Design a protein around this nucleic acid. Sequence first.
DNA 1: TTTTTTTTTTT
Length: 738
Amino acid sequence: KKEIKLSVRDLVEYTERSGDIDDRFRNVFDRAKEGQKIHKMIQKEYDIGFLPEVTLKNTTLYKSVNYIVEGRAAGIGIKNGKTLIDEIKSTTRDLEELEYNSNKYHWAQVKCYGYFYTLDNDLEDIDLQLTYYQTDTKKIKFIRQNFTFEELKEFYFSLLEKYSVFTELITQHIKKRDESIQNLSFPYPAFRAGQKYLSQNVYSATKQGVDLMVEAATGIGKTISTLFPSIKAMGEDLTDKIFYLTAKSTLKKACNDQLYLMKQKGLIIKSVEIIAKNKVCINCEFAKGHYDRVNKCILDMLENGDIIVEEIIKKYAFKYRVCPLELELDLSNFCDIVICDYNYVFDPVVYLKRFFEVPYLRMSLLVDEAHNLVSRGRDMYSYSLSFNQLMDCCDELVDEKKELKIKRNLKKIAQQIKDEALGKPVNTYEDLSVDLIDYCVRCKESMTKFLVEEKDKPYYDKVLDVYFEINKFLKISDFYDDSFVTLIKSENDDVIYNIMCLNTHNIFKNLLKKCKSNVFFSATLSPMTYFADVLGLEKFYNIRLESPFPKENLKVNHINISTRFKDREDTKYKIAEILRKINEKPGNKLIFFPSYSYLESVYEICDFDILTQERTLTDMERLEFLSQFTTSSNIMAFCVLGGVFSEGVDLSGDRLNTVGIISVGLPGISVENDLIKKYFDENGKNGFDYAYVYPGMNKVHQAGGRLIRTDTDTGELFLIDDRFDSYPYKSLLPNSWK
DNA sequence: TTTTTTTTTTT
Ligand SMILES: Nc1ncnc2c1ncn2[C@@H]1O[C@H](COP(=O)(O)OP(=O)(O)NP(=O)(O)O)[C@@H](O)[C@H]1O
Ligand code: SF4
């Protein structure tokens, strides 16, 4: 009844940690596919006897606790008469710096595998080996040592004793947590309309291990209707960790608020909110010694903490002088609910490697406002290189031998970009440039040694940047397949070399299979088959719940006036007349435009007071703008589709009574959107509908939902575009708006 | 045939 499930990597991480952060080497820009090619070549040099990728498992009773531990060896078999266990690892360190215990974590892991194999095969001795390789050089080194069963047993039991401090707190928390969840009731007086159907579908998806897409209108309560069923499934041992993913830092409060309410009702749970490094930094000196003190801060927080938020993290981090970022990544290993941005799961650079590399746990994702993951998902797998930045770094170097080789490598990359441009303002290529990748790798090797010996140099920051850009550019290039294209733009006195991800379906799908359950939900997720396709869902269930509000409180007026780009200057006065008549109505009014250029054009011919939105608006200014939407003002406001005021605004009651939308929201025709249109055309999809209509109409959907926020709120919606009564736009309009 | 605004976490 005392059981703790753990990976060998997680056991060694908390038992062998020591020293400072810079002593531990982390390459988050490692090209994995290239490394896996080296990994496979090493395993091809094995024998039919040396079996590869062998899973090793062990259950050991220690301190009355059953430690169920699992790991995977890269190879096991008899070699030279002795059984050999081989582990393959990528390294950025020099091979000469690699020796018997150079990396304690690596050798602790292979020793655990040895104890497992020796015990199950009556072996008395085993040879343990670490095969190290550098992905950019393909250089390989081997370190082989012999170990006795008794020595391995003593080492393994030592690691268990070091982890015992955590095991206990975890065991007691799981008992109290499941008890609280089993006795926990819906934290509100009664279920609202759709809540029972939504919760049941979320609970079933988590229990069966399936992907569920949900379009739920305002008023149904998407946060509690997703979190409560997910937490209940945790209390019934159906999932181990819940991830609440947000597209903006503001949306994390809703999840913490619902958890606070359930705590009041008896819920015993541990949650952590991950905050970006540049936001949780207290005020680097904690880096020295961090790994010698981080475990005790964790034990204090796990024992005395529940819902962990930014303030608490910084307090304990300052208290124990540990880096707050590394603290919170650690806490997420020991928390039940992880609240964090999409990047921590889907981005290739910052994803939580501890969880989404080799999952040994059941993970359930709750993706809030998933409509936002389409554009953002493409940005995570797209990157650029700029000729000007590379050349400007060259003009800072001072001809010193070390800087000269870097200056040369930078010029090679710059010339390769200019050559691939072919004197064309826009150039495209289906395949990735091997030469550009080769030049980027060489430049990286040349700058590495300088970065470690010249921090005093005054242009170090500029040189560190181009290093980051080329590193990240190389990392994105590892994903390049036939859902990518090369685009080279020659404008603004710069040649910008871009690797663009046109579709994230394959990459995201290979990520969602590592989780047990996935729930994508938003108020605007139409059509759900489009969003499912682009975000990697292949086998799934779709639930569309409509407004739980009275249909007599909303009045929708379609106005058939052409807003096509070629007719805007001709139809602007008709729009100005409609808006002037709207201005006569009582209450405040939000009028949305597809572009700033349209907003200013209509604004000019409007002879009445109008509050407009400017491109650059600080947080305070944004609060001032919305503050003028008093319940006693009579303000007409001009805003932009897809802008900061199209999402989030909660102008309830009489702060807003009229919303007007001027286009079907089509994105500006562009070469970026044309490549996306052509990709989907050549893959069996309506390209225009994928690149233009569906994102467009979804923006209309966003802005119109600013109007009715409560079942008491009433208002008028104005849809001004002859396309709102044409296909396919009318089908994409909400049923209440037609 | 069709005409854009803007968040996130990374050295
Ligand atoms: N059964 C319920 N009874 C009372 N209040 C509830 C109930 N369910 C949810 N709520 C509350 O109603 C609000 C719903 O918030 P949330 O789920 O974030 O948005 P929503 O209602 O889905 N609207 P939106 O996000 O704009 O589409 C919160 O204040 C909840 O606490
Ligand atoms: S305390 Fe701040 S500067 Fe120091 S390691 Fe942590 S995040 Fe970096």
